[PDB]
Amino acid sequence: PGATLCLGHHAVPNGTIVKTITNDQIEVTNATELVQNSSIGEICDSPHQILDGENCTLIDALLGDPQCDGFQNKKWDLFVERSKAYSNCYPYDVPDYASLRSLVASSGTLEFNNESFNWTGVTQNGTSSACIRRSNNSFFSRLNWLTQLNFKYPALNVTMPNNEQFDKLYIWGVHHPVTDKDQIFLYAQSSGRITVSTKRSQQAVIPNIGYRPRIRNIPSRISIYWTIVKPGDILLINSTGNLIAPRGYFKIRSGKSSIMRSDAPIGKCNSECITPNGSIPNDKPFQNVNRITYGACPRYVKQSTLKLATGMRNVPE
Amino acid sequence: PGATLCLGHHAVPNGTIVKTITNDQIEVTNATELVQNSSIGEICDSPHQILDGENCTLIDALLGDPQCDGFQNKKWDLFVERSKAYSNCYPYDVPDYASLRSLVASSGTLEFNNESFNWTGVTQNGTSSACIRRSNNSFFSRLNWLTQLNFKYPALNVTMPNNEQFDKLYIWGVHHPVTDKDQIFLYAQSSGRITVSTKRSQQAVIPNIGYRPRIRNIPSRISIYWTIVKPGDILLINSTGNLIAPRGYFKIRSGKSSIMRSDAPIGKCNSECITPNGSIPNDKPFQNVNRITYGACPRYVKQSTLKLATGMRNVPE
Amino acid sequence: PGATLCLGHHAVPNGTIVKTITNDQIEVTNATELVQNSSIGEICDSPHQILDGENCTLIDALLGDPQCDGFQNKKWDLFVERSKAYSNCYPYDVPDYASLRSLVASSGTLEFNNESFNWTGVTQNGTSSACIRRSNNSFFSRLNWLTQLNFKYPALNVTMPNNEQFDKLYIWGVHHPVTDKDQIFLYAQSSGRITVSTKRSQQAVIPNIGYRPRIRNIPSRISIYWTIVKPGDILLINSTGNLIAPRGYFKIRSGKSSIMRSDAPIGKCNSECITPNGSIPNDKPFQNVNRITYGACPRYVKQSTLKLATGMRNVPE
Amino acid sequence: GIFGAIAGFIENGWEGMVDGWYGFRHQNSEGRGQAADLKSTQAAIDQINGKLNRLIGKTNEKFHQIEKEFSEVEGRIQDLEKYVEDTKIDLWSYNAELLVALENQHTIDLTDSEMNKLFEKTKKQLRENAEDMGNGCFKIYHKCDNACIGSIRNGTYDHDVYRDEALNNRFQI
Amino acid sequence: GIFGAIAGFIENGWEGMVDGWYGFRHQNSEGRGQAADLKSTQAAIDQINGKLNRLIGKTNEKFHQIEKEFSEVEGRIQDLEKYVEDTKIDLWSYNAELLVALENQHTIDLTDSEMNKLFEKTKKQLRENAEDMGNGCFKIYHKCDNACIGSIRNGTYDHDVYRDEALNNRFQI
Amino acid sequence: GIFGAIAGFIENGWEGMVDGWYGFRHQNSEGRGQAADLKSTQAAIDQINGKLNRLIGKTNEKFHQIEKEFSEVEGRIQDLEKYVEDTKIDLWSYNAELLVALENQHTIDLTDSEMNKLFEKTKKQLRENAEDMGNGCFKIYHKCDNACIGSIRNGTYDHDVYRDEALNNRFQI
Ligand SMILES: *[C@@H]1O[C@H](CO)[C@@H](O[C@@H]2O[C@H](CO)[C@@H](O[C@@H]3O[C@H](CO)[C@@H](O)[C@H](O[C@H]4O[C@H](CO)[C@@H](O)[C@H](O)[C@@H]4O)[C@@H]3O)[C@H](O)[C@H]2NC(C)=O)[C@H](O)[C@H]1NC(C)=O
Ligand SMILES: *[C@@H]1O[C@H](CO)[C@@H](O[C@@H]2O[C@H](CO)[C@@H](O[C@@H]3O[C@H](CO)[C@@H](O)[C@H](O[C@H]4O[C@H](CO)[C@@H](O)[C@H](O)[C@@H]4O)[C@@H]3O)[C@H](O)[C@H]2NC(C)=O)[C@H](O)[C@H]1NC(C)=O
Ligand SMILES: *[C@@H]1O[C@H](CO)[C@@H](O[C@@H]2O[C@H](CO)[C@@H](O[C@@H]3O[C@H](CO)[C@@H](O)[C@H](O[C@H]4O[C@H](CO)[C@@H](O)[C@H](O)[C@@H]4O)[C@@H]3O)[C@H](O)[C@H]2NC(C)=O)[C@H](O)[C@H]1NC(C)=O
Ligand SMILES: *[C@@H]1O[C@H](CO)[C@@H](O[C@@H]2O[C@H](CO)[C@@H](O[C@@H]3O[C@H](CO)[C@@H](O)[C@H](O)[C@@H]3O)[C@H](O)[C@H]2NC(C)=O)[C@H](O)[C@H]1NC(C)=O
Ligand SMILES: *[C@@H]1O[C@H](CO)[C@@H](O[C@@H]2O[C@H](CO)[C@@H](O[C@@H]3O[C@H](CO)[C@@H](O)[C@H](O)[C@@H]3O)[C@H](O)[C@H]2NC(C)=O)[C@H](O)[C@H]1NC(C)=O
Ligand SMILES: *[C@@H]1O[C@H](CO)[C@@H](O[C@@H]2O[C@H](CO)[C@@H](O[C@@H]3O[C@H](CO)[C@@H](O)[C@H](O)[C@@H]3O)[C@H](O)[C@H]2NC(C)=O)[C@H](O)[C@H]1NC(C)=O
Ligand SMILES: *[C@@H]1O[C@H](CO)[C@@H](O[C@@H]2O[C@H](CO)[C@@H](O)[C@H](O)[C@H]2NC(C)=O)[C@H](O)[C@H]1NC(C)=O
Ligand SMILES: *[C@@H]1O[C@H](CO)[C@@H](O[C@@H]2O[C@H](CO)[C@@H](O)[C@H](O)[C@H]2NC(C)=O)[C@H](O)[C@H]1NC(C)=O
Ligand SMILES: *[C@@H]1O[C@H](CO)[C@@H](O[C@@H]2O[C@H](CO)[C@@H](O)[C@H](O)[C@H]2NC(C)=O)[C@H](O)[C@H]1NC(C)=O
Ligand SMILES: *[C@@H]1O[C@H](CO)[C@@H](O[C@@H]2O[C@H](CO)[C@@H](O)[C@H](O)[C@H]2NC(C)=O)[C@H](O)[C@H]1NC(C)=O
Ligand SMILES: *[C@@H]1O[C@H](CO)[C@@H](O[C@@H]2O[C@H](CO)[C@@H](O)[C@H](O)[C@H]2NC(C)=O)[C@H](O)[C@H]1NC(C)=O
Ligand SMILES: *[C@@H]1O[C@H](CO)[C@@H](O[C@@H]2O[C@H](CO)[C@@H](O)[C@H](O)[C@H]2NC(C)=O)[C@H](O)[C@H]1NC(C)=O
Ligand SMILES: *[C@@H]1O[C@H](CO)[C@@H](O)[C@H](O)[C@H]1NC(C)=O
Ligand SMILES: *[C@@H]1O[C@H](CO)[C@@H](O)[C@H](O)[C@H]1NC(C)=O
Ligand SMILES: *[C@@H]1O[C@H](CO)[C@@H](O)[C@H](O)[C@H]1NC(C)=O
Ligand SMILES: *[C@@H]1O[C@H](CO)[C@@H](O)[C@H](O)[C@H]1NC(C)=O
Ligand SMILES: *[C@@H]1O[C@H](CO)[C@@H](O)[C@H](O)[C@H]1NC(C)=O
Ligand SMILES: *[C@@H]1O[C@H](CO)[C@@H](O)[C@H](O)[C@H]1NC(C)=O
Ligand SMILES: *[C@@H]1O[C@H](CO)[C@@H](O)[C@H](O)[C@H]1NC(C)=O
Ligand SMILES: *[C@@H]1O[C@H](CO)[C@@H](O)[C@H](O)[C@H]1NC(C)=O
Ligand SMILES: *[C@@H]1O[C@H](CO)[C@@H](O)[C@H](O)[C@H]1NC(C)=O
Ligand SMILES: *[C@@H]1O[C@H](CO)[C@@H](O)[C@H](O)[C@H]1NC(C)=O
């Protein structure tokens, strides 16, 4: 009689379909998903330092819009800008807004050091009803609106050396009055001129007097500019009207900081990978949640699923 | 005696050489080409909507150069610009020409809506012998050359709100006269100034009076600019001379439209993939015809041939 | 009795660890390194034409800073800029410095042809104590500082046609005096204006009078600009003060030329691949020496080592 | 698969084998039974775990990058930012597709291989005492009780003990 | 190839086999002949068609992109546009080179495998009635006419029918 | 490895084999010895050299590119230049990692294969004159002196010469 000995392998009743080099559908005993396709719908506050912009854009927090006063000197790994954010101070624009936003985001700090600029012959601390702080007329916290004093505005020629071992970031502006009248009332001469310079740079701006469409009922504007001043270098403000002066400088750092547009709520949780949709687990090598990411994240791909076989070919009985 | 049974495989007398991991030349029974290396030398008019620029660049069709009048309000998937194209209206330049060309190309439409701008105190519809339309002096169809009326040019302060649910694209310009004389003859004052603004933007331009080298015997110029105005926003033209005014706006759409430089003739045929050399079949995954493509196309690679084995190793008798 | 015949394979006592699809550490009999991780610390002068900038940046060699006179008309495959380089002529800036540096680097030549510009009514060849050449006051070799003659500076309207079959590169500048006084002393009128134009372009510059922080004790500046003039086109300089005139043009070529920042010494040796660290052998497909390379080079990767198995699995006795 | 065992000469798998991936079924004088082979099972599992360790929990940190959504039409710069990102995503998407296809082909082949190795090992072990029936089964030409079958599964089967009995059974008329 | 059959122990292919990729040649009492094996042929063809289906007619649509030819010298921006495109093309060119090399190695190996599987299947089928001559041929140790050869090719050969005759022929002196 | 010979049924390698990669050890009436097999050795070496030729000394020339280090903060353009380069490097780094992993898996498998091919070839050669002991060794059931062993190694062994002697030794009681 003897015996029979058969060699074999397992199988399951519920196999999973995977792709190979030659087959776009072959059944294996088991597989695991390689594409993360969901988020938990909130941005975990850990382990990255999250700064929720709330009603403030980073630029508004920078300039010191009154609703953004709570942001002074704060740092972040990730600044989160909300789609509902809005400005509520003096209407302004920033040529190359995108680059200023980027370089501040990347710096990761709103650390501001006041400096005593020699403003002689002008009225300091100009305010407006378009920028209300604690029920009073006010202005951007980091900016100093200079106007005429005793119907004069003499020529400014103010120097500020950088004797630090870090770069200094200066934010300053030009006011564009609505009328030749308003121009004289504010600065005593018909034509403003601002020159901001360093050893290695010079930015010259002439105001443009005229009407713009009203924003929050204001038809005038401020244009915002920036200047970086390195160690051993010097900031020179050579102006004859219309200057919105810096009160000091922002530190610029380097590191891992960024900014992200998202309306996802901040949660009390811990997740390495942030997308605008919310934090995502990072166990999988790939993800199709969002091309925008921050932290230790799976790589964005177009596929919604990629199944890695973790077992043999399934050959049911 | 018994029998002999031999197992074997086919072979061919004319094998093909392919590459593997270990061999850059190994013969297999058959192979197929993966790199598309030829075009049919014409751009098929189907299935994409082709607009042949003929003598017109897209920008000339946009401005309304007289030879481009047949292009009014046309749409395209692909605008084809010919190397022989030339301008034959008032000589002009466009700062960031490349971006305007790109954004119009991508929009995919020349749809233009006239608007009734309040031009009071100036002579409208200025024409020139440098822009001949139907044997008369003329001008760009979409532009309105404003000049003095009764030796005066008063200050314009003209508003146009966007109450549509689409963006509006405005094209406008500045005329640079050749002499201080010509300046006064046209605009009644020595210095022009144009300010075009919205809630979220402001562009200020001063003309530069002076000679340029002649183009089609004209030593003066027009500089062309654009402004996009979103829903709820307003266009403000605040000018005192030298304005080349818009007559209206172009719609800006989004979708699959583009532009391509090619001298290939348009054919009556159907091909998904367009290159500047002509349409190419898209059966193969790769192609070395042109890095420039439009539509469902093989990916550009440097190799002129890549042979995929479709049979076994060939071992002739 | 009979015999025993055993089939087998070699092994070594000193195997090497490699990675596979399934194992990040498996021992094979032999392997070869695929990542080049070292340089010889010098840039071989062969086979590429190396031009060592020494104390000169490419832009200083271009303008003709006196310490850079030995660079006149030289060509390079690779221009090497040293971190110790410094300017020692009239202090200047270049808007889009990076693009001018790039286009000259890429052109690969400092070939300069003098041209006889019709400068009538002005004093040519202005010099300064801020640009010492052979113990005398001097200026940039390729630039011609034009100033008033007989307390007049008449309106210049100077033409130079390109009747060559190559493009011409023109370098020119604007002088910014420190005072309204110095302005009149140099150019006879309070306001300079420069217009440089071609058929297809126009650049207009107004000087900005004012103080800048001192560089080598000079508080004035020159701003440098460039203009390319194609065959059949014409250069027009239409100026009324403050022009730093070209003396001619640079040829612009195309080819394989570039520029690299490095402090590695030049050696008398032969190596195809140059990095800022020094030349590297190019036998390996990859390298982690520097992402910056020139010539036939391994591709930069992040790994410091990648071992390719060149033998079987090692199974010691 | 490339070895021809799984979904090949082995007609099908065994759903009732839940304590291993490969193994043995027998019939002899004392009944019929199943036992998992742990070594082959572990060899397959170790290799699959090796892959997984190269792909799971190994993500890469990025911080400040470029913008990838835009609220205004800008032209050239934005075209470039969008094209860079689209380029990147398509390359990674390709990498992911290829990776999974290659990994999966390889997983099927290596698991087929392990089945084949176990079969080959058992065939050699049995020497002249059994014949291959072509379907993964050996006809063993001698009495082989439970301890005997166990000895085959455990690598302690001494073919010389049974050889005379087996040869007589194999080569009879 | 990795199995050692095609361009290995099988000395060469058969140019006169035009109705299949693998098959059988025999010599017996009634002559010599050739027949294709359809199953192995189809197994190879199906796999190659599977690859082809993953690569032919599967192109990707792109519309507005960046410019890639330039009529003016511009510097920084153009350097970046050119570098992005050169980067992309080199990555795709690499992908294409690798893909074809891997696919082709695999095609050669899988076709070698199918040859090997058919050989192995036939070897097991013949049991003790034939011996492997080492060159893909079996010496069958019994009378095996055309119907007999057909039965081997069709999987209906009953080795027990011939075993006595074959053993006597094999193990004679 | 995927064939199960190297680090499989062959227990270990031979450190004392320095004139080839694969070979033969024997014991017979005249002693014990070792000889390299040149054909299998060369087959492995040729394949590995083929890979190497596809990767060593094959670099690509680039000239003017983009800047990759920056002395000033600039924002948008620099963000893009840095991201393009980081993108590129990560893609090439991935390509290099994958390439080496695949190449190395393949090298191990092909070398395992060659060992297996040599074993199989020798097994078939010996016909009914030897049996596979399961560890890469054959018990040869006849007197096989040095010239006889040489004949096996050189492919001139005539199995018919020894078959009667071997069958008698194999199938005795
Ligand atoms: C199908 O294939 C997949 C992938 O191979 C397989 O999933 C894996 O299962 C194991 C065991 O169930 C998982 O391991 C666990 O992971 C969790 C989460 O990370 C850990 O918390 C667990 O740790 C505990 O348990 C350990 C012992 O198992 C303890 O040693 C430890 O101290 C903890 O108490 C544990 O490691 C593994 O995460 C998954 N892998 C993936 C990628 O999902 C699945 O089981 C297979 N399915 C079948 C039906 O076989
Ligand atoms: C070498 O290898 C290649 C690739 O495997 C192989 O080329 C293929 O050949 C087949 C058959 O000749 C082609 O299939 C045809 O394709 C055309 C064009 O797309 C179709 O019009 C055909 O459709 C008709 O025929 C079908 C039956 O064959 C009908 O069912 C159908 O209704 C139509 O009447 C048909 O599908 C295939 O396109 C090529 N593939 C490639 C990539 O070229 C070639 O034959 C092999 N050479 C040798 C000598 O074996
Ligand atoms: C481990 O694996 C590696 C890679 O397979 C292997 O390294 C290779 O060794 C050979 C021989 O030692 C090298 O070939 C030499 O290369 C040098 C430098 O390029 C040449 O100068 C040599 O040319 C001379 O010698 C030839 C004959 O060998 C003559 O024909 C010729 O005219 C010259 O006189 C020679 O080609 C080869 O470069 C390396 N490859 C690499 C990538 O390093 C190494 O030997 C293996 N180690 C062991 C212990 O097996
Ligand atoms: C130049 O044109 C601009 C744009 O049309 C003119 O601006 C408009 O000025 C009027 C005058 O006050 C503004 O009206 C005010 O609106 C507010 C808000 O509803 C209302 O509370 C006030 O009672 C008043 O009606 C109008 O909003 C404003 N329009 C825009 C778009 O800004 C401007 O008057 C012109 N300038 C000159 C000098 O002629
Ligand atoms: C400033 O310099 C410019 C550039 O050199 C001068 O432009 C030139 O002006 C003359 C005067 O008419 C032009 O001549 C004309 O050419 C046409 C075409 O061939 C011909 O038909 C006319 O009969 C006449 O000869 C000349 O083309 C023109 N050159 C260029 C390059 O534009 C200009 O005159 C100077 N301006 C002043 C105010 O001095
Ligand atoms: C506007 O402000 C600028 C910047 O502060 C003033 O520049 C400064 O001018 C003084 C006057 O000579 C310079 O002093 C000189 O320094 C050199 C070098 O050490 C020394 O050898 C001389 O004896 C002299 O002391 C000073 O360096 C310079 N500072 C800078 C930063 O450039 C300028 O005076 C002001 N202009 C007007 C018109 O008021
Ligand atoms: C995460 O958010 C992104 C961006 O909002 C979502 O992607 C968009 O999805 C909407 C609606 O399905 C589409 O109209 C857009 O075209 C998508 N944009 C892009 C860029 O893909 C995405 O669906 C969200 N994913 C998850 C998992 O929540
Ligand atoms: C952010 O802004 C919103 C809207 O401007 C604020 O919500 C309003 O707050 C006012 C003043 O207390 C309330 O009267 C309203 O009930 C709110 N309006 C709406 C539409 O929600 C919100 O409080 C601000 N948040 C922060 C954190 O400053
Ligand atoms: C398609 O057109 C392109 C671009 O004109 C051709 O590529 C050029 O070919 C010319 C002449 O062979 C070369 O001088 C250029 O250097 C090529 N340019 C580039 C960017 O590669 C190409 O040959 C054409 N291909 C086909 C199949 O017609
Ligand atoms: C595009 O422009 C070309 C050249 O300007 C036109 O061809 C000329 O047309 C004129 C006027 O009828 C003829 O006298 C000439 O025979 C043509 N010259 C040349 C050099 O070809 C052409 O007609 C224009 N095409 C379109 C579609 O407007
Ligand atoms: C080649 O030079 C580069 C650049 O200087 C070196 O990379 C830097 O190394 C320093 C010190 O180890 C680090 O602080 C920097 O972060 C590195 N920079 C980058 C961009 O990686 C590199 O170490 C040198 N390599 C060799 C082999 O000499
Ligand atoms: C490059 O510049 C350096 C520093 O300016 C020069 O070195 C100095 O040369 C002076 C003048 O002969 C000497 O008195 C000093 O000994 C040097 N100083 C230092 C700090 O090294 C150098 O000679 C210049 N090189 C070239 C090639 O022009
Ligand atoms: C298959 O079914 C079993 C039985 O319920 C279940 O436990 C297992 O998780 C399933 N596995 C897969 C991969 O679907
Ligand atoms: C700079 O300041 C000096 C001294 O106050 C003054 O003469 C000059 O006009 C100023 N320059 C500008 C551009 O305002
Ligand atoms: C080989 O030759 C035959 C006979 O003419 C031909 O039909 C076939 O298409 C050729 N195939 C290849 C791949 O060259
Ligand atoms: C704008 O229009 C108003 C009213 O006509 C006028 O006073 C003002 O000067 C204009 N502004 C410009 C810049 O032309
Ligand atoms: C291993 O050791 C030998 C003996 O000295 C040496 O010659 C050889 O180069 C070594 N090989 C490797 C790859 O380490
Ligand atoms: C200017 O200098 C050049 C070069 O030294 C010389 O040839 C020319 O005569 C000078 N021109 C004048 C007007 O002095
Ligand atoms: C150009 O030159 C002419 C003639 O000399 C002069 O009238 C005109 O003012 C100049 N233009 C400029 C911008 O200097
Ligand atoms: C074989 O091994 C099993 C597993 O532990 C053991 O229980 C059994 O007693 C062994 N049988 C023989 C016959 O060696
Ligand atoms: C084997 O199959 C072939 C193919 O159809 C058939 O024609 C033949 O009659 C069969 N022969 C035997 C002996 O079963
Ligand atoms: C086998 O080949 C070897 C290698 O050259 C040779 O020296 C030897 O004489 C041969 N032996 C026999 C028995 O053929």
SS3 per-residue string spanning chain A: CCEEEEEEEECCCCCEEECCCCCCCEEECCEEECEECCCCCCEEEECCCEEECCCCCHHHHHHCCHHHHHHCCCECCEEEECCCCCCCCCCEECCCHHHHHHHHHHHCECCEEECCCCCCCEECCCCEEEEEECCEEECCCCEEECEEECCECCCCCEEEECCCCCCEEEEEEEEECCCHHHHHHHHCCCCCCEEEEECCEEEEECCCCCCCCCECCECCEEEEEEEEECCCCEEEEEECCCEEEECEEEECCCCCCEEEECCCCEEEEECCEEECCEEECCCCCEECCCCCCEEEECEECCCCCCEEECCCECCCC
Q: Does B215 touch chain C (CB under 8 A)?
A: yes
- Alpha-carbon distance D100 to D44, whole Å? 18
* Residues C300, C279: Cα–Cα separation, whole Å: 14
Ligand 13 centroid from CA D97, angstroms: 25
E32 min Cα distance to partner chain D (Å): 27
What's the B129 CA to ligand 5 centre distance in angstroms? 17
Measured in Å, residue B218 CA sits from the centre of ligand 5 at: 9
Inspect the interface and report whether the beta carbons of D106 and C24 lie closer than 8 Å: no
CB atoms within 10 A of CB B229: 24
Experimental method: X-ray
Contact of A119 with A159, CB cutoff 8 Å: no
Cα angle E12-E18-E19, degrees, rounded to a multiple of 5: 120
Q: Which amino acid is at F30?
A: E
CA angle B271, B274, B278 (to 5 degrees): 90
Contact B315 E63 (CB under 8 A): no
Query: CA-CA distance, E28 to E152, in Å (whole number)?
Result: 13
Q: Are E1 and E19 in contact (CB under 8 A)?
A: no
Please list, in sequence order, all residues whose beta carbon lies within 8 angstroms of the beta carbon of residue A124, skipping any fewer than 6 positions away: A144, A145, A146
The two beta strands, A258-261 and A78-81, are parallel
Cβ pair C98:E76 closer than 8 A: yes
DSSP H stretches of helix in C11-57: none
Q: Which of B298, B305, A102, F55 is nearest to E59 (CA)?
A: B298
- In this structure, are residues C63 and C171 in contact, taking their beta carbons and an 8 Å threshold? yes
Amino acid occupying residue E153:
R
Q: Which chains have at least 3 CB atom pairs separated by less than 8 Å from chain D?
A: A, B, C, E, F
Tell me the C-alpha to C-alpha distance, in Å, between residue D61 and each of A272, A279, B110, D99, E47. 9, 14, 45, 21, 39
> Residue D68 and residue C294: Cα distance in Å, rounded?
31
- Sort strands C194-198 and C201-205 into parallel, antiparallel or unpaired: antiparallel
Give CA–CA dist B25/C80, Å, rounded: 42
Range of the domain at E121: 1-173
Backbone dihedral angles phi then psi of residue C267, each to the nearest 5 degrees = -110, 160
Mutate which of B93, B208, B216, B222 to test chain C, going by most C C-beta atoms within 10 A?
Answer: B208
Integer Cα distance of B208 and E154 in angstroms? 94
Q: Which residues pair with A258 in a beta bridge?
A: A78
Asked if A24's CB is within 8 angstroms of E106's CB, the reply is: no
In single-letter form, the type of residue at position C246 comes to: P
Residue E118: C-alpha distances to residues A159, E32, F119 (Å): 90, 20, 20
Nearest CA in chain B to D72: B228
Q: What are phi and psi of A266, to 5 degrees?
A: -85, 130
Residue B225, SS3 per DSSP: strand
Alpha helix positions (H), chain D: 38-55, 76-126, 146-154, 159-170
What phi and psi, each to the nearest 5 degrees, are found at residue C13?
A: -75, -25
Please indicate if any CB of chain E lies within 8 Å of the CB of C96: yes
d(CA E29, CA B292): 68
Encode burial over A85-117: b for 16+ CB neighbours within 10 A, e otherwise. bebbbbbbbbeeebbbbbbbbbbbbbbbeeeeb
Buried b / exposed e over C143-169, threshold 16 CB at 10 Å, is: bbbbbbeeeebeebeeebebeeeebbb
Per DSSP (E only), the strands in F74-158 are: 130-132, 137-140
Element (H, E) at F164: helix F159-170
The b-or-e profile of C112-137 (16+ CB within 10 A means b, else e) is beeeebebeebeeebeeebbebeeee
Of B313, A21, D102, nearest in space to E2 by CA: B313
Coarse DSSP helix, strand, coil percentages of chain C, rounded to the nearest 5 percent: 10, 40, 50
Structure tokens at B69: 């009048």
Instruction: Give the count of beta carbons closer than 10 Å to the beta carbon of residue A70.
Output: 9
Q: Do residues A316 and D15 lie in contact, with contact meaning Cβ atoms separated by under 8 Å?
A: yes
- The atom number, within ligand 11, closest to the CA of C41 reads 28
Q: How far apart are the first and last CA of chain D?
A: 39
Of D109, D120, D128, which has the smallest distance from its Cβ to F2's Cβ? D109
Reading the block at residue B163, the tokens are 């109450």
The full DSSP string for chain E is -TTSTBTTTB---BTT--S-SEEEEEEETTEEEEEE-HHHHHHHHHHHHHHHHHHTT--EEE-S------SS---HHHHHHHHHHHHHHHHHHHHHHHHHHHHHHHHHHHHHHHHHHHHHHHHHHHTTSEEE-SSSEEEE-S---HHHHHHHHHT---HHHHHHHHHHHHS--
Q: Is F145 in the pocket of ligand 22 (CB under 6 A)?
A: no
Report the distance separating Cα E10 and Cα B171, nearest Å.
Answer: 77
Cβ neighbour number for residue A171 with a 10 Å cutoff: 25
- Across the beta sheet with C299-300, the strand order is C35-36, C286-287, C299-300
CA D106/CA A26 separation, integer angstroms: 13
Phi/psi of residue F167, each to 5°?
-60, -45
Residue B159 CA neighbour count, 13 Å, CB half: 10
Least CA distance to F51: which residue of chain E? E101
Q: Mapping DSSP to helix (H, G, I), strand (E, B) and coil, where does residue B185 land?
A: helix
Which pair of tokens denotes residue A92?
């302004």
Four-point Cα dihedral C38, C41, C47, C51, nearest 10: 140
For the Cβ of C289 lying below 6 angstroms from any atom of ligand 11, the answer is yes
Q: How far is CA C221 from CA C171, C175, C245, F71, in A?
A: 16, 6, 15, 22
d(CA C187, CA C243): 9
- The whole-angstrom separation of Cα A225 and Cα E135 is 84
A310 in contact with ligand 1, CB cutoff 6 A: yes
**Per the CB < 8 Å rule, is C96 touching E74?**
no
Ramachandran sector of residue E55 (left: φ over 0; alpha: ψ -120 to 50; beta: rest): alpha
Which chain F residues contact residue B303 at CB under 8 A? none
Residue B236 CA: nearest ligand 4 atom is: 4
Neighbours of F135 (CB within 10 A): 12
| Backbone torsions φ then ψ of A13, nearest 5 degrees | -75, -25
Three-state secondary structure call for residue C287:
strand
- Indicate which residue's Cα is closest to atom 8 of ligand 9: B290
Q: Using a 6 Å cutoff on CB, does residue C14 contact ligand 17?
A: yes
Say which CATH number the domain at D1 has.
3.90.20.10
- List the one residue out of A312, A314, A250 whose CA is nearest residue A107: A250
C64 burial type by CB count under 10 A (0-12 exposed, 13-18 middle, 19+ buried): buried
Which residues partner with B33 through β-bridges?
B307
Pocket of ligand 2 (CB under 6 A): B 30, 32, 310; E 52, 56
Best of D111, D124, D159, D169 to mutate (most F CBs within 10 Å, chain F): D124
CB atoms within 10 A of CB E123: 16
Backbone angles phi, psi at A66, to 5 degrees: -55, -40
Separation of alpha carbons C199 and E52, rounded Å: 55
Three-state DSSP state, C188: coil
Q: How far apart are CA A52 and CA A50, in angstroms?
A: 6
Torsion angle defined by CA atoms of residues D163, D164, D165 and D168, in that order, rounded to the nearest 10 degrees? 120
A317 close to D13: Cβ distance less than 8 angstroms: yes
* Six-digit token string for B207: 């003309």
Tally the domains of chain E: 1
Asked if residue C47 has a cis previous peptide bond (ω within 30° of 0), the answer is yes
C-beta neighbour count of F173 within 10 angstroms = 6
Helix (H), strand (E) at residue F117: helix F76-126
Contact call for residues F29 and F16 (beta carbons, < 8 A): no
C-alpha–C-alpha distance, residues A299 and D60, integer Å: 8
Task: Tell me if A82 sits within 8 A of A59, measured CB to CB.
Answer: no
The CB density around residue B151, as the number of other CB atoms within 10 Å, is: 8
Q: Do residues A216 and A181 make contact, with C-beta atoms less than 8 angstroms apart?
A: no
- Please name the residues in contact with B73: beta carbons below 8 A apart, sequence gap of 6 or more: B109, B110, B111, B112
The two three-digit tokens of residue C315, written as one number? 């199974």
Sign of CA dihedral B151, B157, B163, B166: positive
CA distance between the termini of chain C: 27
* Nearest ligand to the CA atom of E41: 2
Out of A51, A52, A54, A55, mutate this one to test ligand 8's pocket (max ligand atoms within 8 Å of CB): namely A55
Q: Return the ∠ at Cα B127 (arms to B122 and B129), rounded to 5°.
A: 150
Q: At what angle do helices E76-126 and C97-107 cross, to 10 degrees?
A: 60
Bond prior to B91 in cis (omega within 30° of 0): no
Distance CA A158, CA A164 (A): 18
Which backbone phi and psi does D118 adopt, to 5 degrees?
-65, -40
Q: List residues bridging with A113 in a β-sheet.
A: A249
Tokens of C303: 């790994």
Residue B47 tokens read as: 């299935």
Q: What is the assigned CATH class of domain A49-264? A: alpha beta
Distances in whole angstroms, Cα of residue C247 to Cα of each of C65, C143, C175, F9: 14, 6, 16, 84
| E56 to chain A, closest Cα gap in Å | 13
Alpha helices in B22-132 (DSSP H): 58-63, 97-107
Evaluate whether C98 touches C259 at the Cβ level (below 8 Å). no
Check if the beta carbon of residue A205 is closer than 8 Å to that of residue A238. no
Residue with tokens 């044997």: B135
Which residue in this structure is represented by tokens 């203009």? C227
Residues 6+ apart with CB under 8 A from C141: C63, C64, C66, C69, C72, C247
Q: What phi, psi does B23 have (nearest 5°)?
A: -135, 125
Q: Tell me how far apart the terminal alpha carbons of chain F are, to the nearest angstrom.
A: 39
CA distances to A149, A205, A224, D103 from A235, rounded to whole Å, are: 24, 16, 17, 60
Q: Distance of CA C257 to CAs C254, C273, F62, F63, Å? A: 8, 14, 10, 6
The separation between the first and the last C-alpha atoms of chain B, rounded to the nearest angstrom, is 27
